[PDB]
Amino acid sequence: AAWKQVPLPTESVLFDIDFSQKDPNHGWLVGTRGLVLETRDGGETWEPRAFNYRFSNVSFSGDEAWVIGKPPVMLRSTDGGKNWSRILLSPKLPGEPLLVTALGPNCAEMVTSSGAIYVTENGGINWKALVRETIDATLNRTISSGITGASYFTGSIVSVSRDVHGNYIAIPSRGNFFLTWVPGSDFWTPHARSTSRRISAIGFIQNDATKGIWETIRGGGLGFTKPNVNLNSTETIAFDMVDSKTGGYGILDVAFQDDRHVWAAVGGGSMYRSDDGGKTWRRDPLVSKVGANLYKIKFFGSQRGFVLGADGVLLKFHPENV
């Protein structure tokens, strides 16, 4: 039994979990309706805590942690969690905070619904922007069959993740294409999708763009790219499509434990598995419960893993059993 559920005292839906670098068993998890829980035994026991909003993510560097939420709210602690400090955000910052990533002492990068990317180096006081050009400024500049032919661009992005070398990947609200940003470039680079249908989710293979990109198509599609893709090249990135075997249910997130073992969360409350890269897929029947929803998978090395779901469902990864 390779996953198994950690019970908790809340009915809120879990959104993110991260662990301190100084004590790798010390970690925090965030959710809806002001949900914040603390761990010091590696995600086996949790106890509620306070600094109420929807908390989107948490991110550690050293012992410094950053949290953001909706409506726009940010907090950090440099104590592992002893004491947290509110951080005011500007109304001319476009969109609302979508992804924070802890970079080091007093350093963090924020990505907003608008696609804007900001770094602070003084613990939240100042935010210097990283991307000169807004996405719709570049979308008004593309000829590669982006949204500018099919749909009009609702100006927000979805499913944004950061690479191990600081590359970003994201998707427009309506899935018509996807977007990437590598450090130093003045704009996101838009890429045409490889499907009939539209894209639902996207990310990097074990958090490294040098191993490729995965995508989830609506109605259960799934594909991966060859390693070493130039995310600045406008020459359409080709995905190799795979038979997810999910039925009509859509994939919600994909996560690699290593090169060969892959896991996926599916709309039916199910959990799918691959042990040959992402090439052939199975549906793990002893971990899938119907009713409870599964939204997100996150590994911390190949021997720590969690799955976050609605109604306070959290599953902890058990390498004994794969």
Side-chain angles (χ1 to χ4, degrees), residues 1-10 12-32 34-225 227-303 305-322:
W3 297 92
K4 184 180 193 112
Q5 170 163 0
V6 193
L8 305 110
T10 202
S12 157
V13 53
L14 314 181
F15 268 69
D16 199 13
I17 184 175
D18 194 17
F19 281 93
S20 156
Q21 268 187 316
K22 148 149 148 203
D23 185 345
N25 289 319
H26 191 15
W28 291 76
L29 78 78
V30 287
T32 325
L35 166 59
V36 182
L37 311 170
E38 183 154 36
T39 298
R40 322 200 48 126
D41 54 327
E44 298 275 16
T45 317
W46 296 87
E47 184 91 31
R49 274 211 59 183
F51 291 127
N52 55 57
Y53 290 70
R54 161 212 158 171
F55 284 100
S56 290
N57 44 290
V58 67
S59 177
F60 264 97
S61 176
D63 206 54
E64 200 169 6
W66 300 72
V67 199
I68 74 192
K70 154 173 293 181
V73 173
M74 205 192 282
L75 303 92
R76 70 178 256 256
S77 72
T78 177
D79 320 287
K82 279 225 141 186
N83 284 275
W84 301 77
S85 295
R86 36 213 58 65
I87 278 145
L88 181 74
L89 309 166
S90 166
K92 50 177 65 178
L93 254 69
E96 66 253 32
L98 189 54
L99 184 63
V100 82
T101 323
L103 302 200
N106 316 313
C107 189
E109 281 184 1
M110 160 178 52
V111 185
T112 79
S113 148
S114 164
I117 304 164
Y118 294 93
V119 50
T120 189
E121 294 175 359
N122 53 15
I125 284 150
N126 302 326
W127 292 97
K128 185 195 126 217
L130 285 190
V131 201
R132 285 181 71 118
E133 208 176 13
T134 79
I135 289 174
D136 291 58
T138 87
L139 284 183
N140 202 36
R141 193 163 49 83
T142 61
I143 52 97
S144 277
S145 178
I147 205 173
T148 88
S151 148
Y152 144 77
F153 182 68
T154 64
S156 299
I157 72 185
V158 167
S159 170
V160 193
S161 69
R162 193 164 160 293
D163 174 271
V164 86
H165 309 106
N167 295 342
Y168 285 102
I169 194 161
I171 204 171
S173 289
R174 289 268 172 93
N176 317 283
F177 57 95
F178 66 99
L179 296 141
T180 69
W181 185 83
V182 316
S185 59
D186 293 310
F187 53 76
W188 291 77
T189 303
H191 310 263
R193 57 177 153 89
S194 59
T195 47
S196 46
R197 296 185 134 287
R198 308 268 175 94
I199 313 174
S200 325
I202 192 157
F204 298 105
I205 280 153
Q206 42 187 343
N207 308 325
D208 187 16
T210 84
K211 325 173 157 287
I213 309 165
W214 62 265
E215 71 182 5
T216 282
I217 309 312
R218 287 189 284 210
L222 179 54
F224 320 85
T225 62
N228 279 95
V229 194
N230 189 351
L231 317 165
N232 288 111
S233 185
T234 166
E235 285 304 333
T236 72
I237 314 189
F239 291 59
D240 294 339
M241 302 294 157
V242 162
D243 177 0
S244 60
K245 283 158 104 211
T246 184
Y249 290 103
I251 307 297
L252 304 165
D253 179 32
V254 170
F256 289 49
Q257 155 188 30
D258 63 326
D259 280 333
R260 286 178 53 194
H261 305 87
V262 196
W263 290 89
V266 173
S270 322
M271 196 77 86
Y272 281 51
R273 195 217 280 256
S274 177
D275 310 325
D276 61 343
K279 300 291 178 292
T280 63
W281 283 87
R282 307 165 19 217
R283 168 240 170 97
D284 203 36
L286 54 150
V287 181
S288 307
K289 327 233 162 271
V290 178
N293 293 333
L294 298 185
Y295 295 149
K296 190 190 155 64
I297 317 187
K298 193 180 196 145
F299 287 74
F300 298 78
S302 81
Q303 307 279 103
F306 296 78
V307 170
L308 307 159
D311 185 280
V313 173
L314 156 70
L315 301 65
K316 156 163 193 311
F317 183 61
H318 283 271
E320 308 69 24
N321 311 319
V322 184

